[model samples]
Target: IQAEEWYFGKITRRESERLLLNAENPRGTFLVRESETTKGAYCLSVSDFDNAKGLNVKHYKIRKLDSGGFYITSRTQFNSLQQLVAYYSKHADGLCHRLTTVCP
Candidate 1:
């Protein structure tokens, strides 16, 4: 599958946070970034809100297995980063919120 608009490669965590928390993005807006600490790994950043925390960006690590598949949790594996994003866009699964908008 083609790469989606939500993929923001090699950006810093702060940059990702800025994009997600921008006034136009709103809640559930998200973007994917290459992990700075872990080579070959990625992160999914999303804007979320709650009564206690109010509004903030949440980050989830997307790890790669020995077999070369990717997963946020071991139980669910995806063939590629795009596949993972596609899955979470439709189903929150274990995310703070389902992906509602791509980071602009």
Candidate 2:
């Protein structure tokens, strides 16, 4: 709840549904939208990060099931998108730096 307060400004339901229904990817920019399966809530999906340079760079999605809780099908489910972004920014940086650097 608090995370939404601190996060980016959002698009409207019409816009969100339009994006989801058409299924376009919002690469690089973080996207949050009205969840398809649940009313009164939102969903998120990010472009696959790092372009596959590391052994494990993942795209992300967080969905609230119609039954009443959130789940990530193949990865950790975070409490909020802000927390999710923080985790990925840290994780991606460590891997990207290592992948590009040659340690002596």
Highest-TM-score candidate = 1
What lDDT is obtained when candidate 1 is compared to the true structure? 0.85
**C-alpha-based local distance difference test score of model 2:** 0.41
Q: Please report how far candidate 2 places residue 86 from its true position, in Å.
A: 1.9
* TM-score of model 2 (CA atoms): 0.37
In terms of lDDT, which candidate is strongest? 1
**TM-scores for all candidates?**
0.88, 0.37
As for model 1, its CA RMSD to the true structure in angstroms is 1.9
- Against the unseen true structure, what C-alpha lDDT does each candidate score? 0.85, 0.41
Backbone clash pairs for candidate 2 read none
